Structure formats: C-alpha cells, structure tokens
Design a protein around this ligand. Structure first.
Ligand SMILES: [Zn+2]
Length: 99
C-alpha cells in the first residue's frame, strides 16, 4: 500500500518567488490581496482576473478578498502540496485542516 506524491513541481519555472511576483504585474485594482503575500505562498497569477495557481501543486484559487491569508488558503485547499509543507511545516497544515 502507498502510491507516492511526485516530487516534480507542476511549473518548475515559477519556482522563483521573484518570477512569481513578476506575474502579478497586472494583478487587478479591485483585487484585495497583496501579490507579495500570494507569491511568497507559491502562487503566481494566470489570466487577467484574480486567478492564481501554485507553482508546485498547481492548486488554483480565485475570488480573493481582504484578509484572506494565501498560506492558509493554500493549506485549506491543497494540504499535500510539498511546497506548502516544506515552507510552513506539518503542524501548520494540520491546524488549518483540523479547523
Ligand atoms: Zn501548492
């Protein structure tokens, strides 16, 4: 028993926070969350609205609102993301899942 999570990022080029930040050059005015927090949390901008995906797990999120924590949204939706886990740790993810 036990298939293993693949180690390969969904989008290796977006592995750089710096490059993820560039993608937010057109992050909308009506959008309520700061790109720097999004990019720190592994997300990069796709399309022209407020859609993001994680570079590693390719989790896709949109409809961002003031107060939304990207790291938390990441843990809420994509708990097995190896990037989220290396960055925030097992305890953090578990705590977002158990609530
Ligand atoms: Zn992820």
């Amino acid at each position: 028993a036990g298939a293993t999570l693949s180690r390969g990022p969904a989008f290796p080029g977006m592995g750089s926070e710096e490059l993820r930040l560039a993608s937010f050059y057109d992050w909308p005015l009506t959008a309520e969350v700061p790109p720097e927090l999004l990019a720190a949390a592994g997300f990069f901008h796709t399309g022209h609205q407020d859609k993001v995906r994680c570079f590693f797990c390719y989790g896709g999120l949109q409809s961002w609102k003031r107060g939304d924590d990207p790291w938390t949204e990441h843990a809420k939706w994509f708990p097995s993301c190896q990037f989220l886990l290396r960055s925030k740790g097992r305890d953090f993810v578990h705590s977002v899942q158990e609530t």
